[PDB]
Each structure stands twice: as structure tokens, then as C-alpha cells.
Amino acid sequence: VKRTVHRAKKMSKTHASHIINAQEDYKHMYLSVQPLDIFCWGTGSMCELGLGPLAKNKEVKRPRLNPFLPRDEAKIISFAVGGMHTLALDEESNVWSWGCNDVGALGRDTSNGDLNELESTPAKIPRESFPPLAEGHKVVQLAATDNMSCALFSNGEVYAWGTFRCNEGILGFYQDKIKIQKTPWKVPTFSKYNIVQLAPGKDHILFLDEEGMVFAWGNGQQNQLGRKVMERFRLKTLDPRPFGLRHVKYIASGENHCFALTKDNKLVSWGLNQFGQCGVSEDVEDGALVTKPKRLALPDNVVIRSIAAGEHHSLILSQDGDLYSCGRLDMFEVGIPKDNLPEYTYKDVHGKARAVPLPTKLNNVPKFKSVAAGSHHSVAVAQNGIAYSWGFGETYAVGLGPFEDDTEVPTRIKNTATQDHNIILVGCGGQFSVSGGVKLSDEDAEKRADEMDD
Amino acid sequence: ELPQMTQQLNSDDMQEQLSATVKFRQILSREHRPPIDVVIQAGVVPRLVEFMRENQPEMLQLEAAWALTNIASGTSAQTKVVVDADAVPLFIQLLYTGSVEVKEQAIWALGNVAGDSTDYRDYVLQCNAMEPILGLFNSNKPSLIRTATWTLSNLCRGKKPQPDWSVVSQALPTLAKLIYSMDTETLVDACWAISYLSDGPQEAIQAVIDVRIPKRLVELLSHESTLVQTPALRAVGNIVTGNDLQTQVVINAGVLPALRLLLSSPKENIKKEACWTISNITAGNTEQIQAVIDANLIPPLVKLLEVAEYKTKKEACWAISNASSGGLQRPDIIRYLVSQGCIKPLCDLLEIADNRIIEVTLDALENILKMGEADKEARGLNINENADFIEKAGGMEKIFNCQQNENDKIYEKAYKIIETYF
């Protein structure tokens, strides 16, 4: 009677249009997969250690478990260490905070031993301060500079507080409209795409979107912002702005120098290069400033995994486990012994080696899986899960014990608190350090002890 | 890199598991030639499905289901690896436990599985995937409902062994809302899923029409591009395959002024499937023919019956031939048809068409002649003039030359109507 009478069935999930990066490519670097025991060491003269107000806890020379961040109930998953303060989010996406709050970098109220109990003890930032949390979103990365904090959300929104500091006094927080931001604040969108990664410095912070564009925000006296700022239009242009850096997969920043990894596996750096920390030129008397991004000459088989840098040194961690360092030698930041100094080390007018201005692979060291760098000290965990710190040690930031001499070579951190632990995340500040990890099973610690101390 | 990635994937450090699972997902997410067999050969598939267990952390489940998604997107043999790892139930479990991210991730993998063949489509339905999938349509992100609608399109799909009407008919109330979306990519998948379901016995055609759907299907007959006009036209096309109380409802939503808009569409398949729809609505009540009469649909159809191609003239003939069938109750349907210039395109169709169209064209020319037989008896005439202009267009010669074809039914009719009127 009545008569009854192409489109794809399968479909791979790939990148869409101009998108180079996805947030999932980054959160494995920052957010731990399981709650961590938090360990702090160094000097907490400015409440950095987060171990309480008692003066006994102001100076800790070996990694000490932080009871204010218990693994069972606080459940700290990630943490970002600034210069005098740190942030940390838990398993329910609540950011913690402890450190110096002279410029509101802690995002919480402080008013009403020697240390301030509110500053020297970690506590949560009010959840109501983050509207995205109430809208069903999570924090995928935290960042902390010297005087400014920042939180990246899973929807691409960015919240930040604190200030940036110029060399003279206080520069400002955002575009002449606000001097100091005490509470978490919504950074207005500055890109058609969502931000995927943060890279904090001393008084600046970088951004990176899915498109691959890099943005800069903060102080730019040392050309950290990838451009130049005149005195007149300084506050008017103080906001996350690009600078001709496109097609970038990964960003990382020292205190006044930055790095960016492009899609074609090309690593460029810019900013301040006082001690060759950018690793771009062999002559250190030549350029104190790298205005235009300059490519680093790493070996061919190298695939960059992470990049950590401090004030005058940089550490490039490869996927094969090798660690490449470049920068200042005056406090053994690069971790290269005096007998293994390469040909291109810089001797000053007095004849003393001052820096290594090119990326140099460390030798006689274990394979590393992560690395962090403070102002003049560094921490890198090996493949088994043991930390190796080196550099400036007069503040016990290397956590190697009661001695004040600098350490020339990455040496093992060994104390009862950390020996049975596999540490996952490590951060470093000005004169302290923070590590987080999980305790191994009694048999997993049995084998590793047989591997090392035999 | 693979020997390193495989070794890092099997390490007991869960964080190293996550970093390795990200690397596998990245190389499996390349746009061209993803190394699916090379990672299948690597023996890491049974561990990827291990990372989707209930106890596993969410970041690990996300990267694992994403990597397995792109493995299932390949050859029908490469999808067999994912299903023989017993991964489909874990995909459905993550539709309950995990967050929005993993739910969008697993609904993508289930879509590639359910779209490979009909046995995998039933297998997905076999594991009670319908209830969690339909529950995903209360979320907010337009991409989640985009991937979920596409998977739901592959579920209503397949006709050689049709999907279980019981487990699939639960989705129409959810599809009735998805047509009202504005995302162009979602509603296209939503319309195709409806056209797949509107095809079947009356248990389905009555079900589609009982859930408020066909009113907007005519509203989406008018859309910008043709990517949505085609599934919606197929949807309203399968609805008229039912009884005449079912076709009567589509007529209410102004379907006929919308069908004329499609009769001049740039895409030819929109022209043809419009004529196929106009064909079946002209096969109901004699008043349903009048609906097509007054709707000004026949002037463009008779010109299609002349200049358009055979794939479209055939369905245009069925529309015109079924229209003349209403002359028993109301002989003026032919009276309206003869004035539009219908006898010449029908007669010129005699030599170019085939056994199945010469049949219906003769039925049209006969019911035209049968009306004129009643015109020369009730009205005073002594010659039937419905045959006067058949040969004015050269049709009496062609129908006389239709007695030579050896098909039984066309020789029995061409010879009968030529003796009855000539």
C-alpha cells in the first residue's frame, strides 16, 4: 500500500581547529594522583615553612612532616611554592595558603614563638571566594610568585591576587585600577581560547592558551614580558598581553627569565641573562638582556619533560632522565663539580668561574623524574623516589643536615621522615623547600634500600 | 619511545602510570595515521582497560578511556581488541561514577563501538547502556550532549538487524528536546537518529508522533544548510509510511508549504525525497489529496516529471499517479491534474521508464481515462476527450507499443485500457 525506502560511524577524538594544547596535557605535571604527605624544610623566618608559630619551627634543616596538612583529612593533592609563600589544593579543590601576607599573596585574612599563627599555619581560603567552585569547576593548576598568587580553573577562567613589585617600590596588581588585591579576584579574559598552563616568576607570570599564544603579566624591567614598557604607559598596559610568541606547547619561568617550548620541539628563552641562565650565548660579558626569544642548542635525542629555573640558574629535565643545567656557579646552583667544568665556563676579571652559559648535562647522577629550583638552590627527585638537593645551603633549604656550606653536586636527602617515602611533587622558594609524597609499602621500601645502601 | 612508554605504563608508581597513559593518548590522538596496531602490538591494551576500574583515580580513567576511544575508531579489527578486553561495561560504569570529563570521554568510545557493526551495537545495548546515556542529557556542556547525541544516533542505527525496539524507544522523549537545540552539529545527529527510529512497524511511527516530535521536524525542513534538511526530511518521510491518521498530523505542521520550498533545493536528493514524501501523502484519504491540491505542490511536480532526471521523475510519477487515484470519490482531482499539463510528461515518460514505472504511469493515464469515461456519460458527450489529448501529446502510439513488452502485468493492462478506450 505504502512504500518504504554519507555519515560517519566511527570518529577519532583529536584536536579541534587551531587548538595545539589541552589542559589534560598538563594536570598530570601538577596535580598528584593520590593524597600526599607534605614535608617542609629550610628557614621559616617569614612564615614560609608553615609549621606553626613556635620559634623552634622557624628553622628546619631536614625534611619534616607538616601535621597541618595531614594526608588523611587535609588530602593535599598539588602545591605551588612562591618566594615567601606557597599555595596548595586538596582533593575537593580547596586552595590552601601559608606564608607572608604583607601584600595579600595568601588570599585570606591574617589580622587578629615569634611567628604569626595565622600566617605560619596553613589553612583554607574561603570557598566562596572562588565562584567557579560553586559553578562546578575545579582548579587544575596553582602558581605563586614572590608577591602574587594565581589559580587556573578547568574552564579556562583565571583567578589571581597579590601584587607585582618593580625594583623601587610596589608596581601594582592590575592596570592602575587596583593597587593590592587582598582576596581572590577574577582576571578578565584576555584570549579567545582557554588558558592551559601557568609559569610564575618573581614579579611576573606567563600564560598559555590552547592556540599556543603566550601572554605575560607583571613586571617587565628585565624584558620578562617579551616586550618593552615605557614609564608613561606602564600602569595602563599592566595586564596579560601577548608579545608575538605563537605555537608554544610548554612554558616555564625563572625569576626574571622565561622559557617556551614550541610545537616543532624548539626551545627558546628570553629575559635577564646575567649568568647565562638562558643558555643561549657563550659570551656572558655580551648580553645582560635577552629581548628577543633565542633558541637553546640541546642535543638531538632530547625530549623536554619539565623546566625549572631560579634567579640565576636553569634546569632542563629530559624524558630520558638526564638533567641539563646552566647559570650561576657562585653558590653551586647548576650542580656541576669544579673538576667537570666544561670548556665554555665564564671566568670574570678576577679569574673565578662565575657561570656556565650553555645547557650542560649533569653526570654521575641518577635518572630524575621531576626537578624544582628555588632562588639559589635546587631539588630533583630520582626515579626511585628519593630527593637530591644542591646549591645554596646557608639557609638549610637543601635539607641535607646541620651544616651551612653549599653543596656542589646533587646529593641524596636522607632522613627518617623521607627514607620510606616516594615523593611525587617538589617545590622551592627563596630560602626553603616543600616536597610531597606517598609512603612505600614495607616491601617496596625493602627493595629500594637494598638498591641504594648496598 | 614505546619500550620506554610500555615500561613506564607498567610501573607501580601510579603517577608514572598517569604520565605514561598521557603519552599513549597523545600519539593515539594524532590527526593522520595513528599507530593503533603498533600500540595494540605493544600489549598495553589490557592495562589501559585496567585503568578504568571503579577504584582507579579519575585522571587515570580519563586518559585511559581517551586512548581506548581512538583505538576503537580504527579498523573493525582494531575495535575488536577493545571489546575483547571487556571494556564496554567499564565504559558504561564511568557514565555513572566519573565526572563530566570522563563521561564525555567514555560516551565517545561507546559511540565508536556501537557504530562499527550491528553486533557491537546490540552488545552496547546488551549491557544496559541506554539508561546511563539518556541520563547524560541533563548536563550543561554542549560538547557532552554533542558526543552523547552522536552515540545515540549509532544506537538507533542499523536496519539489517534492527535495534531492540524496547531498549531504544526510551530515547525519543530525550530526542524530542534535542531538536530544539541550536548547535548545528548536535541536532544533525539528533535528526538522523529520529529518521532511523521512524522507520519500522506502526509501533514506532505511532511512537515517534506521540512524543511531540514531528511539529519541529517541519520547522527544521527550513534550515540554513542541507546537512540537517536531509535527516529531517527522511524523518518526516518515514512518518507518512503509516496509516492516514498518522500522515494527517504532519499535514497540520504546515508540511506542504515546506515541501514546495524543498522542491527547488540545490541538492537533488532533497528534491527526490520530497517527491517520495509527497507520493505517500497522496496515497491516503481523498481529502489528503486535496491538501496536496490546494498547497500548490503539483505545478512544480509536473515540471519535475518533464525536465528532472529519472531518479526524481520516478518519485514524481508516484506522487502524480497516486494523486489521480482519488478520482473515484472525487473526479475533479484529475480535472485539476489535466489543467496543469500532466498528460504530456506522463506520456513522454513511457519510452524512458521501466517495468515498475510504466505500470504506475499507465495507472495514472488509466484513471485519467476512467474519469473521462464518466465525463461522456453523465455529461452529454459522445467522445471521451481524456483520450483526445493523450495522442495530442503522442501517447496513444506509446501505449499501443506497450503491448510488445513481455512483462505480464503491463501487457495485461496496456492491452486492456487500449481496448477499453481505443
PDB file of N, CA and C in Angstrom, chain B residues 86 129 132 224 260 266 311 354 358 420:
ATOM      1  N   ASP B  86      36.960  -6.634  27.361  1.00  0.00           N
ATOM      2  CA  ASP B  86      35.831  -6.463  28.277  1.00  0.00           C
ATOM      3  C   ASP B  86      35.724  -5.019  28.764  1.00  0.00           C
ATOM      4  N   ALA B 129      23.258   0.061  28.372  1.00  0.00           N
ATOM      5  CA  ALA B 129      23.855   1.376  28.181  1.00  0.00           C
ATOM      6  C   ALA B 129      22.822   2.479  28.005  1.00  0.00           C
ATOM      7  N   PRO B 132      22.118   4.912  31.418  1.00  0.00           N
ATOM      8  CA  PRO B 132      23.114   5.957  31.714  1.00  0.00           C
ATOM      9  C   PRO B 132      23.253   6.989  30.609  1.00  0.00           C
ATOM     10  N   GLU B 224      19.326  26.587   7.365  1.00  0.00           N
ATOM     11  CA  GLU B 224      20.330  27.228   6.524  1.00  0.00           C
ATOM     12  C   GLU B 224      20.945  26.254   5.524  1.00  0.00           C
ATOM     13  N   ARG B 260       7.246  22.360  -0.823  1.00  0.00           N
ATOM     14  CA  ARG B 260       7.495  23.121  -2.044  1.00  0.00           C
ATOM     15  C   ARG B 260       8.829  23.856  -1.973  1.00  0.00           C
ATOM     16  N   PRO B 266      18.868  23.192  -4.012  1.00  0.00           N
ATOM     17  CA  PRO B 266      20.051  22.924  -4.848  1.00  0.00           C
ATOM     18  C   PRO B 266      20.501  21.476  -4.815  1.00  0.00           C
ATOM     19  N   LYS B 311      15.783   9.521 -11.623  1.00  0.00           N
ATOM     20  CA  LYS B 311      15.716   9.195 -10.202  1.00  0.00           C
ATOM     21  C   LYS B 311      14.708  10.073  -9.474  1.00  0.00           C
ATOM     22  N   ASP B 354      10.781   2.061 -17.147  1.00  0.00           N
ATOM     23  CA  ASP B 354      10.853   0.647 -16.855  1.00  0.00           C
ATOM     24  C   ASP B 354       9.596  -0.065 -16.367  1.00  0.00           C
ATOM     25  N   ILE B 358       6.358   2.249 -15.867  1.00  0.00           N
ATOM     26  CA  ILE B 358       5.327   2.124 -16.896  1.00  0.00           C
ATOM     27  C   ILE B 358       4.033   1.611 -16.280  1.00  0.00           C
ATOM     28  N   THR B 420     -10.362  -0.683 -24.048  1.00  0.00           N
ATOM     29  CA  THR B 420     -11.469  -0.046 -23.347  1.00  0.00           C
ATOM     30  C   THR B 420     -11.726   1.367 -23.858  1.00  0.00           C
TER      31      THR B 420
END
